[PDB]
């Protein structure tokens with residue numbers, strides 16, 4: 497469960513939120529593989545409800561109608577084609593598995609689905625699976641509304657509807673089998689693992705019963721006995737009967753406290769400063785490193801739809817975001833997931849964004865293709881953070897320092913810190929309102945290194961800042977509080 501199953505030397509996965517299968521296939525070959533990315537988290541590949549009010553929101557993909565690989569991202573052929581090509585180049589695919597529920601109970605019956613499948617929420621009829629009233633928890637839920645009303649009662653959190661979404665009776669072997677049938681179909685196609693959506697709303701024991709029916713990874717690409725990588729989405733920030741530690745037996749879990757705390761520290765909210773990050777990790781109340789999937793922001797909380805709230809950093813906060821992602825990718829704690837989003841028209845009113853529902857860039861509902869600009873950036877309103885030099889170069893930085901310990905930490909008692917990873921890497925941050933100028937111990941061998949944040953090493957030279965390391969491993973760093981990117985990073989592979 498716990499191993500990502502990525503190729504030796506690749507330590508991160510990227511979430512290509514709402515991308516089309518064909519675009520991802522191309523991305524695997526032209527960028528992901530050459531730049532050292534380990535894998536890709538894709539949006540739910542199964543048939544979902546088509547919602548026109550509001551116009552095709554991103555969240556309609558979390559309301560399943562069937563298990564047919566047919567969505568706005570593409571059909572089953574294009575999906576299979578994407579997995580094959582990505583695997584052939586060393587980049588794995590992780591499927592977002594929405595297995596806790598089906599669509600909202602209020603949705604109108606008919607054929608308003610991404611594949612024309614018929615469904616009737618009112619009578620609990622989903623013929624394309626098939627599921628009937630006997631496969632839902634309507635009789636098991638005890639709340640008066642039928643939905644989840646209090647998260648302090650772990651029982652209704654699991655047996656009732658999450659904001660109206662019809663809740664699957666996962667204790668029934670029939671339902672467990674229909675779900676395994678779906679996941680095994682994907683495993684046999686070549687996927688390397690799954691993100692279990694709304695895992696908090698499922699009993700750890702029901703999840704385990706389903707994972708027991710799963711096949712080993714495809715023997716054409718993976719070594720015999722390979723088990724699918726499993727990370728469960730559980731939002732646990734304390735103060736609830738449900739703890740993410742209850743799911744350690746099924747696989748890893750999403751550590752939402754990670755992004756929340758990093759955001760407040762980097763924003764310097766209510767007393768926090770970067771010097772406190774010295775004991776970052778479990779020392780902060782986080783889950784063990786070998787059970788954590790970490791990230792700065794997610795498709796959910798980057799638009800206020802998840803835990804984290806106001807402190808969360810996103811592409812909208814470019815400068816601070818790059819630093820946050822940089823710290824995460826440099827730090828040894830957990831398995832890192834990089835975000836890749838699209839721009840939407842944020843419309844704030846009373847502190848809340850009324851356009852948080854807006855779906856991906858599209859032409860009358862047809863998702864726009866991801867175009868690549870001459871400078872490697874993306875067009876058609878795709879942000880492509882994974883293509884930002886500062887982020888892409890930190891992904892590579894993680895690969896280079898994989899395995900090296902945390903050493904040579906430094907801080908000015910405020911917001912200027914630095915630390916290294918064994919003798920393969922070093923990073924410096926200046927988040928104070930004044931310039932940083934000092935000679936630090938880097939633990940790196942003597943030589944001239946290229947700063948991978950400001951530039952790149954291109955055939956014998958640096959296109960940006962250059963750092964000189966002496967025999968005793970010391971080097972001088974200068975970062976004005978006015979730099980576009982107030983941090984510098986160098987590693988063994990950026991060495992001249």
Ligand SMILES: C[C@H]1O[C@H](O[C@H]2[C@H](O)[C@@H](O)[C@@H](O)O[C@@H]2CO)[C@H](O)[C@@H](O)[C@@H]1N[C@H]1C=C(CO)[C@@H](O[C@H]2O[C@H](CO)[C@@H](O[C@H]3O[C@H](CO)[C@@H](O)[C@H](O)[C@H]3O)[C@H](O)[C@H]2O)[C@H](O)[C@H]1O
Nearest residue numbers: 555556558559600601659660661693694696731796801803
């Ligand atoms: C969103 C978050 O809510 C909880 O998170 C709780 C948290 O556990 C608790 O501790 C406290 O912080 O409150 C949070 C919000 O209630 C869960 O614990 C967690 O698992 C879940 N996150 C994952 C799963 C779902 C569901 O399929 C997705 O929802 C996403 O899809 C849903 C279905 O299309 C959307 O509902 C939409 O459709 C419903 C249909 O009846 C409508 O009633 C609803 O008004 C509408 O917004 C939802 O807005 C969106 O966020 C989401 O994208 C995905 O990341």
Ligand SMILES: *[C@@H]1O[C@H](CO)[C@@H](O)[C@H](O)[C@H]1NC(C)=O
Nearest residue numbers: 953954955956957958959992
């Ligand atoms: C690096 O660039 C300089 C010019 O700025 C050039 O003289 C030198 O030969 C280059 N080195 C390599 C290895 O390409």
Ligand SMILES: [Ca+2]
Nearest residue numbers: 654663697698
């Ligand atoms: Ca449930």
Ligand SMILES: [Cl-]
Nearest residue numbers: 691729750794
């Ligand atoms: Cl997530």
